[PDB]
Each structure stands twice: as structure tokens, then as C-alpha cells.
Design a protein around this motif. Structure first.
Motif, PDB file in Angstrom:
ATOM      1  N   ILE A 225       0.822  -1.192   0.000  1.00  0.00           N
ATOM      2  CA  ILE A 225       0.000   0.000   0.000  1.00  0.00           C
ATOM      3  C   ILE A 225       0.867   1.257   0.000  1.00  0.00           C
ATOM      4  O   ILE A 225       0.707   2.117  -0.862  1.00  0.00           O
ATOM      5  N   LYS A 226       1.801   1.346   0.943  1.00  0.00           N
ATOM      6  CA  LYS A 226       2.669   2.516   1.033  1.00  0.00           C
ATOM      7  C   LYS A 226       3.511   2.676  -0.223  1.00  0.00           C
ATOM      8  O   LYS A 226       3.762   3.794  -0.658  1.00  0.00           O
ATOM      9  N   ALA A 227       3.957   1.560  -0.795  1.00  0.00           N
ATOM     10  CA  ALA A 227       4.760   1.596  -2.009  1.00  0.00           C
ATOM     11  C   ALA A 227       3.961   2.227  -3.147  1.00  0.00           C
ATOM     12  O   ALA A 227       4.492   3.036  -3.902  1.00  0.00           O
ATOM     13  N   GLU A 228       2.686   1.862  -3.264  1.00  0.00           N
ATOM     14  CA  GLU A 228       1.828   2.450  -4.294  1.00  0.00           C
ATOM     15  C   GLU A 228       1.488   3.902  -4.006  1.00  0.00           C
ATOM     16  O   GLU A 228       1.382   4.699  -4.929  1.00  0.00           O
ATOM     17  N   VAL A 229       1.294   4.247  -2.739  1.00  0.00           N
ATOM     18  CA  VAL A 229       0.991   5.626  -2.387  1.00  0.00           C
ATOM     19  C   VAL A 229       2.167   6.515  -2.782  1.00  0.00           C
ATOM     20  O   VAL A 229       1.985   7.589  -3.353  1.00  0.00           O
ATOM     21  N   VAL A 230       3.373   6.045  -2.488  1.00  0.00           N
ATOM     22  CA  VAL A 230       4.581   6.787  -2.798  1.00  0.00           C
ATOM     23  C   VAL A 230       4.839   6.834  -4.309  1.00  0.00           C
ATOM     24  O   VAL A 230       5.282   7.858  -4.823  1.00  0.00           O
ATOM     25  N   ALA A 231       4.546   5.747  -5.021  1.00  0.00           N
ATOM     26  CA  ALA A 231       4.756   5.702  -6.481  1.00  0.00           C
ATOM     27  C   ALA A 231       3.884   6.743  -7.199  1.00  0.00           C
ATOM     28  O   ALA A 231       4.312   7.352  -8.189  1.00  0.00           O
ATOM     29  N   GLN A 232       2.664   6.931  -6.697  1.00  0.00           N
ATOM     30  CA  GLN A 232       1.732   7.929  -7.238  1.00  0.00           C
ATOM     31  C   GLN A 232       2.212   9.365  -6.990  1.00  0.00           C
ATOM     32  O   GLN A 232       2.110  10.215  -7.875  1.00  0.00           O
ATOM     33  N   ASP A 233       2.740   9.622  -5.791  1.00  0.00           N
ATOM     34  CA  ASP A 233       3.199  10.961  -5.407  1.00  0.00           C
ATOM     35  C   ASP A 233       4.250  11.518  -6.387  1.00  0.00           C
ATOM     36  O   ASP A 233       4.315  12.730  -6.592  1.00  0.00           O
ATOM     37  N   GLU A 234       5.073  10.643  -6.974  1.00  0.00           N
ATOM     38  CA  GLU A 234       6.082  11.075  -7.974  1.00  0.00           C
ATOM     39  C   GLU A 234       5.455  11.535  -9.299  1.00  0.00           C
ATOM     40  O   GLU A 234       6.074  12.288 -10.049  1.00  0.00           O
ATOM     41  N   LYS A 235       4.244  11.069  -9.592  1.00  0.00           N
ATOM     42  CA  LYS A 235       3.525  11.499 -10.795  1.00  0.00           C
ATOM     43  C   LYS A 235       2.726  12.767 -10.469  1.00  0.00           C
ATOM     44  O   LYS A 235       2.875  13.788 -11.137  1.00  0.00           O
ATOM     45  N   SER A 237       2.186  14.965  -7.159  1.00  0.00           N
ATOM     46  CA  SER A 237       2.529  15.328  -5.787  1.00  0.00           C
ATOM     47  C   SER A 237       1.309  15.732  -4.952  1.00  0.00           C
ATOM     48  O   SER A 237       0.827  16.862  -5.054  1.00  0.00           O
ATOM     49  N   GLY A 238       0.824  14.802  -4.121  1.00  0.00           N
ATOM     50  CA  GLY A 238      -0.332  15.068  -3.260  1.00  0.00           C
ATOM     51  C   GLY A 238      -0.919  13.888  -2.491  1.00  0.00           C
ATOM     52  O   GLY A 238      -1.354  14.052  -1.351  1.00  0.00           O
ATOM     53  N   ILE A 239      -0.931  12.705  -3.103  1.00  0.00           N
ATOM     54  CA  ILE A 239      -1.526  11.509  -2.478  1.00  0.00           C
ATOM     55  C   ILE A 239      -0.752  10.969  -1.247  1.00  0.00           C
ATOM     56  O   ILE A 239      -1.337  10.292  -0.399  1.00  0.00           O
ATOM     57  N   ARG A 240       0.544  11.268  -1.148  1.00  0.00           N
ATOM     58  CA  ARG A 240       1.355  10.794  -0.018  1.00  0.00           C
ATOM     59  C   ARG A 240       0.922  11.428   1.295  1.00  0.00           C
ATOM     60  O   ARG A 240       1.232  10.918   2.364  1.00  0.00           O
ATOM     61  N   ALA A 241       0.208  12.544   1.208  1.00  0.00           N
ATOM     62  CA  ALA A 241      -0.287  13.233   2.387  1.00  0.00           C
ATOM     63  C   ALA A 241      -1.259  12.335   3.139  1.00  0.00           C
ATOM     64  O   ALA A 241      -1.295  12.347   4.365  1.00  0.00           O
ATOM     65  N   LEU A 242      -2.020  11.534   2.392  1.00  0.00           N
ATOM     66  CA  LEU A 242      -3.016  10.628   2.968  1.00  0.00           C
ATOM     67  C   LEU A 242      -2.485   9.734   4.100  1.00  0.00           C
ATOM     68  O   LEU A 242      -3.257   9.289   4.954  1.00  0.00           O
ATOM     69  N   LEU A 243      -1.177   9.485   4.113  1.00  0.00           N
ATOM     70  CA  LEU A 243      -0.557   8.669   5.158  1.00  0.00           C
ATOM     71  C   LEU A 243      -0.590   9.324   6.532  1.00  0.00           C
ATOM     72  O   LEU A 243      -0.336   8.657   7.531  1.00  0.00           O
ATOM     73  N   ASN A 244      -0.897  10.618   6.578  1.00  0.00           N
ATOM     74  CA  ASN A 244      -0.944  11.374   7.832  1.00  0.00           C
ATOM     75  C   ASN A 244      -2.282  11.350   8.564  1.00  0.00           C
ATOM     76  O   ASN A 244      -2.520  12.191   9.437  1.00  0.00           O
ATOM     77  N   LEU A 245      -3.158  10.413   8.225  1.00  0.00           N
ATOM     78  CA  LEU A 245      -4.451  10.327   8.896  1.00  0.00           C
ATOM     79  C   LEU A 245      -4.253  10.276  10.402  1.00  0.00           C
ATOM     80  O   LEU A 245      -3.489   9.456  10.894  1.00  0.00           O
TER      81      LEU A 245
END
Ligand SMILES: NC(=O)c1ccc[n+]([C@@H]2O[C@H](COP(=O)([O-])OP(=O)(O)OC[C@H]3O[C@@H](n4cnc5c(N)ncnc54)[C@H](O)[C@@H]3O)[C@@H](O)[C@H]2O)c1
Ligand SMILES: NC(=O)c1ccc[n+]([C@@H]2O[C@H](COP(=O)([O-])OP(=O)(O)OC[C@H]3O[C@@H](n4cnc5c(N)ncnc54)[C@H](O)[C@@H]3O)[C@@H](O)[C@H]2O)c1
Ligand SMILES: [Cl-]
Ligand SMILES: [Cl-]
Ligand SMILES: [Cl-]
Ligand SMILES: [Cl-]
Ligand SMILES: [Cl-]
Ligand SMILES: [Cl-]
Ligand SMILES: [Cl-]
Ligand code: NA
Lengths: 352, 360
Positions: A225-235, A237-245
Motif C-alpha cells: 500500500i505505502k509503495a503504491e501511495v509513494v509511487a503515485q506521489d512522484e507522478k 505530488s499530493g496523495i502521499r499526504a493521505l498517510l498522515n491520517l
């Protein structure tokens, strides 16, 4: 009988091995006998798991060395970083040295950063031994040390050569620490994977019993999950924020209750509950969705209630934009949530 | 007049701007009003160029702050790095802050490493004010600080967003520092480019007269050459940049902290390397003389220090580096414009080269 995840980073791509009794497979380290390895751990973890790693290196034929740092977040400093540098320099280690970070998140961050800076970068291998480090430190490449004026403000993005996770080390991990880590496990289900949340509901008992298969599957899916969240952020920049719930409210509890009183995961749990209720009050999720979120954190033996003596003022003190769930499995960064709603979320969570 | 060199590194590509009066052009910084900016320099350079830069930031509308570090290699440490972190934190700067490194190589490396680690990386602009930093630091991504047990052993590869080189700043640079810088400019000609060496011979006097056209071309050429060497090293060749460093460090170690400037030790080191090369047949007598002649024309020391014996060199080149007899490794020129790493150079040849250079 182990899963393997490959974090896609091209030249930096690496494997995360997750399984039971993995500290017995020398091939997961990918080292030659000519390579010189240095294990950096703390005084607590050393006697427990260093020997397994040390035997793993002797089979390969590597020349090794052990460095024991003091155990504690108070020692996640530039001074301790320097202790790692001094050690590497007094023993004339070259840029070809391989550093193994064996320990929790404190060691992961400090040694990772130590590995990033030594002669501008040397290979390092993570061996996280806490549930939290296994599900959060394993992906993303964040390393850091603290400064008197700020936590995790000095650091670097540095990827490991490999990450080895033996679910057996969790057996000696204190009950609270284990629970604290489940907060993060549960987070992934909430923000990104509905199927994984349902699976967690059904397997909590098994996870807390330290069932091998359940642990392996849980840790492995968090890393994906985290790997995909981070992979998206490089395209975009914004989805990695979701990890801060939960971190916004959570941080306020830790900051107010004093660091080290409440573990980070426990504070994240209550914060997640407050976030969920805020989401409900904003119409992003319904009553029953909140109840499922609350119920699972309770089942994981985590705090879900607003601290008895924290006032709304105490929260605002440390809080003044939030990550809110938009269902079970989807979330979003919501901008412009009225104070009144936040206040009511906080107060409502005294009844949960 | 202005040259612009784009250093190609994919997503991390950056421009190097070189010219007279660049400190009067705010556009070169690529900043925005209300954007947080911090200038880190030292006590010597601050009063000479901080006002110019601060003027640009005020024009643009940036909120800025100035940090003046102490001047000296002895302060290029992890603790001074910590002082920059402290400065940034006490101003509550976010990841959007821009750090400007204004100074020589010491500031360039240290502030660069600071920029690399603050919140895991913030944008930094490099404004090198010494000739050496302009031709050696502007390309390569190397940042670092010293450790008591090792020079430049703590650092990172971090690229700047931009490099701004205003050649006017050389006007205030002490004569010695300028010449030390030339030892590196000449280095590029000897090891990688014949045409540029010839050009340096012809225009050396213009360079010392601080001619704007000469300065711009010399510095732009050095940056281009290094950019190629570096990009070609990713595919070894970068190690050829150490021409003279072996002999050089021996001089620096022997003479003591900041007695000889690095460029000075490099110059005499280069002459010793060149002679060793001549004796080994790697270059001829006339080639050795052009190297000797151009370094003298640059007002640089080219002789073995008078008070330093052969044994003195060996204690540093061999004993202290655990290099046994028959193991010496040296970068030697193979002509004016080519070079190679040569090993096993007999101590007898090095010995006579060191002796011959006492009276060149
Ligand atoms: N780099 C990242 O992306 C990332 C992500 C999350 C957290 N972190 C960092 O991680 C740190 C917290 O990590 P943590 O929660 O692991 O705390 P920790 O590293 O302090 O470990 C908790 C305690 O358990 C002990 N311990 C570890 N493994 C054990 C085991 N197997 N058996 C018995 N005891 C064991 C340690 O000695 C320590 O006393 C924080 O500093 C945080 O900033 C980093
Ligand atoms: N990163 C790299 O690729 C690289 C390459 C070469 C050298 N370096 C580093 O650079 C450092 C040496 O740099 P340096 O030779 O510029 O020394 P320096 O930075 O100490 O500058 C020399 C002196 O000139 C002063 N100064 C600078 N600009 C001036 C100006 N315009 N007018 C008057 N005074 C001025 C400084 O205060 C200092 O006293 C070393 O630590 C070396 O490791 C790095
Ligand atoms: Cl040992
Ligand atoms: Cl502590
Ligand atoms: Cl409470
Ligand atoms: Cl100021
Ligand atoms: Cl002068
Ligand atoms: Cl050397
Ligand atoms: Cl000859
Ligand atoms: Na030749």
C-alpha cells in the motif's frame, strides 16, 4: 513460506522480505564474502537479534563489526549520528562498506541517515524489529535525526539495498509497542484499501496471538500500500499526504501529554477516531462507517477516547487542512474545515 | 555579455550563469515575492556582497535573513552545519525556503550539505565568490563537511537549482586566492583539453588584469569540461582531476594548517607530477617546460619547499597512507591535454623528480 515486495525505484529498486524465521536465510542479504558489514543497533536489541544476523554473515564469509547505540528517542540526535561516523572512520571503512540497521524506527532513521551521509552514501540494509518500523520505515526512504529546536528536521531520502522482516522478533516486543504499530496497520485499510480493512476486522485475534501467516500477510500488504501511495506521489505530488491520517490531532495529544507518555501509535489511534468523526460531521462518511473505525481500534486494544483532561484549547494550541476518510478505504486532504466542527469532533470523542 | 551553461542531469538539470554584473539581475535567482530566503555567508564576504544580494531579494519582495558563519576551513565541521540547522529552525522555515550559499568553496560545501539535509532537502542557489569555487564547485554535486578523523567524509550529492557567477566579485579576492584558483583552471587544460591550455597561455595576462571577456570564457570553459567529465564518469575519468593532489597533500600536511593555500600546494604538486611523468617518458622535456612556464606566469609556487626533505614526502605519501614500496599511485600527464592513472612508479623516479623541482 514468505512474501516479497519489490519497491520500484529503478536503479534504487529493492526487495522487502517478510516472513517467519527469515533471519536464517543468508540469500536475503545479497552479500559477497569480500564485503565488509557493520551492524548498528541499540543496547536492547543487540543481545536479542544480533547473533542471528552475525551467524548469517559468517556463513556468507563477510567480515563484520557491531556498534551498540544507546536505546531511546532522546538519543536520535546529531551527536549519536556522529558516533556512527567516528566509528566508521576510526576503523578505516571505505565507500564499499555495508551498514545494517538492526532495530526499531529510532535506529532505522538514525542509521539510515548515517548511511546516507558517510562519504556521501554507502549501502545499507534495514532489519526493522518493531511492528511500526516494519510497516512505516520499510518504504519511503525517510531518514532523520532530531534537533533541540525540532523533531525530524535534519535528514535525507535514502533507499536501502534490502529490507528483511522476520515476524518472529515481534514476540519479544512489548504489548503496547505492538498495539501502537497496529494503529498504522489499521490506517492503511482506512485510507486506501477497503478489502484489507475487512480482512483486519476478521483477523485481529489472530494478529494479537502472533499468528505467523496473519502477521506476514498484514505487514506485506502495508508495505505494498505505502509503495503504491509513494509511487503515485512522484507522478502527482499530493496523495502521499493521505498517510498522515490522525497525525494532526495525534500530534496535539503527544505534545500536550509530554513525549514518551503516550506512544505515537496510541496517539494516532485517538487522532484517527477524531478525524473520522470530523469526516462524519462534514458529511464525508456516515454513522455506521465511523462505528466500524471506532470498533476496530477498540478491538486492537488502543485508546479511542479524547483524553479526560485535554481541553479544546490544548488541541488548538498545537494544531493552530486535515486528512479525512471519505469512506472505509478512501480518504482525502480536506481544506477549510470549520473550527466548530473540529471542536465538536473532539468533544464527541469523549463518549466513545 | 553572459554565458549560460545547462548542466544536464534529467529532472535535476540546472543553469550556470557567468558574467560581469550578474549581481544586478534579480531574474537569475528565480524567486517570488513573500518566498522565504536565507543567505549564508561568512564574516569576510558578508560586508562585500551580502548588501548586493539582499538588494535583489528586496526588489523581488522576498522575506530574507542573513547568517554569517566564521571564515575558515577549521570551521567546515558538523557543528557549523548544526549552526545552520539551528538558524533555519529558529526562523520556523518550511521546505519552501530557499538557501543561498554566498562565498567560496567552504561555504559552498557546508551550506550545500545544510540545504541537502534540512527537512531532507530544500532548494539552494550557489553564488561562488572565489575563482576555485567557480571552476570546481559549480559542477559535481559534492557537498561535505570535515570530521576530526577525515576531510570531507560527511556529506551528500546535492544539486543546486541555479549557480550565479558574477566575475566582478574576483576584484576583491586576495591575489593569492586568485592564483590558487588558476592552478585548477590550468589543471583542466593539462589533463583534458589541449586547445584550452594554448588559450590559457595566450590570455593569462588578460586574466590577471581581470578582463571580463577572458574571465567569462575561462570559467565557462572549466564548467563545460567538468560537466562532460562527470557525465562521462557515470558511464574512472573523473579521478584524473587529482593531478598533483598526492604531492600536494604531502606539502599541505607538512607545512601546517592554512600556511600554503590548497591551489599553491597543487601547483608545486603538478610540477612534481609533470616531472615524474617526463622521467617515465610519459611527456617530453618541452611539454614539462610549458607546464612549468604557465604556472609561473600565473604567479604560483612551482618548487619543492626548501625546508621539506624526500623523507618528509614519503612519510605522508607512504607511511601514513599505508602505501608500501612499489605501491605508489599517481595521476600523471601523458601530454598537454591527456592524462592517466599510473601505478608502481618507482620511488627512485619520484625521489629524483622531487629533487629536480627544488631548483626549477
Ligand atoms: N523513516 C520513517 O519513514 C519513519 C516512519 C515512522 C516512524 N519513524 C520513526 O521511528 C521512531 C519510532 O520507532 P519505534 O516506534 O520502533 O520506536 P523505537 O525504535 O524506540 O522502539 C521501541 C522500543 O522497543 C525496543 N525494541 C525494538 N525491537 C524490539 C524487540 N523486537 N523486542 C523487544 N524490544 C524491542 C527498543 O529498544 C525501544 O526501546 C520515531 O523516531 C519515528 O520518527 C520513522
Ligand atoms: N565540492 C567540490 O567539488 C569542491 C571542489 C574543490 C574544493 N572544494 C572545497 O572548497 C574549499 C576551499 O574553497 P576556497 O578555495 O574557495 O576557500 P574559501 O572558501 O575559504 O575562500 C578563501 C578565502 O577568500 C575569502 N573570499 C571568498 N570570496 C571572496 C571575495 N570575493 N573577496 C574577498 N574574499 C573572498 C573567504 O572568506 C576566505 O577567507 C575546501 O574545503 C574544498 O574541500 C569543494
Ligand atoms: Cl566486534
Ligand atoms: Cl527517550
Ligand atoms: Cl486519558
Ligand atoms: Cl537578518
Ligand atoms: Cl592582496
Ligand atoms: Cl591524496
Ligand atoms: Cl625529453
Ligand atoms: Na605521452
Amino acid at each position: 513460506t514468505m512474501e516479497r515486495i519489490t519497491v520500484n525505484l529503478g536503479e534504487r529498486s529493492y526487495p522487502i522480505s517478510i516472513g517467519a524465521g527469515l533471519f536464517a536465510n543468508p540469500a536475503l542479504l545479497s552479500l559477497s564474502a569480500k564485503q565488509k558489514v557493520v551492524i548498528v543497533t541499540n543496547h536492547t536489541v543487540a543481545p536479542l537479534y544480533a547473533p542471528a544476523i552475525i551467524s548469517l554473515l559468517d556463513h556468507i564469509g563477510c567480515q563484520h563489526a557491531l556498534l551498540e547505540l544507546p536505546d531511546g528517542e532522546q538519543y536520535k540526535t546529531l551527536e549519536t549520528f556522529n558516533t556512527v561516523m567516528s566509528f566508521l572512520l576510526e576503523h578505516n571503512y571505505s565507500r564499499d562498506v555495508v551498514v545494517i540497521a538492526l532495530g526499531g524506527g529510532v535506529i532505522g532513521d538514525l542509521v539510515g541517515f548515517a548511511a546516507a551521509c558517510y562519504q556521501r552514501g554507502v549501502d545499507f540494509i534495514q532489519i526493522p524489529t518493531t511492528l511500526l518500523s516494519q510497516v512505516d520505515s520499510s518504504v519511503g526512504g525517510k531518514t532523520a535525526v532530531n534537533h533541540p529546536l525540532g523533531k525530524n528536521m535534519i535528514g535525507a531520502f535514502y533507499q536501502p539495498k534490502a529490507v528483511v522482516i522476520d515476524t518472529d522478533c515481534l514476540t519479544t516486543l512489548p504489548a503496547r509497542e505492538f498495539a501502537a504499530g497496529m494503529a498504522e496497520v489499521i490506517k492503511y485499510g482506512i485510507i486506501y484499501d477497503s478489502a484489507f480493512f475487512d480482512w483486519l476486522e476478521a483477523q485481529m485475534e489472530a494478529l494479537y496471538a502472533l499468528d505467523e501467516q496473519a502477521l506476514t500477510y498484514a505487514i506485506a500488504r502495508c508495505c505494498q500500500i505505502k509503495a503504491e501511495v509513494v509511487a503515485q506521489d512522484e507522478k502527482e505530488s499530493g496523495i502521499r499526504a493521505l498517510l498522515n491520517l490522525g497525525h494532526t490531532f495525534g500530534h496535539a495529544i503527544e505534545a500536550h501529554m509530554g513525549y514518551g507518555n503516550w506512544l505515537h501509535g496510541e496517539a494516532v489511534s485517538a487522532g484517527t477516531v477524531m478525524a473520522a468523526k470530523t469526516a462524519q460531521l462534514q458529511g464525508l462518511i456516515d454513522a455506521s462507517q465511523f462505528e466500524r473505525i471506532l470498533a476496530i481500534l477498540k478491538k486492537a486494544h488502543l485508546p479511542v477516547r479524547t483524553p479526560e483532561n485535554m481541553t479544546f484549547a490544548d488541541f488548538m494550541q498545537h494544531m493552530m487542512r486535515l486528512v479525512l476518510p471519505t469512506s472505509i478505504g478512501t480518504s482525502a486532504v480536506v481544506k477549510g474545515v470549520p473550527e466548530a466542527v473540529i471542536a465538536q469532533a473532539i468533544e464527541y470523542c469523549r463518549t466513545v
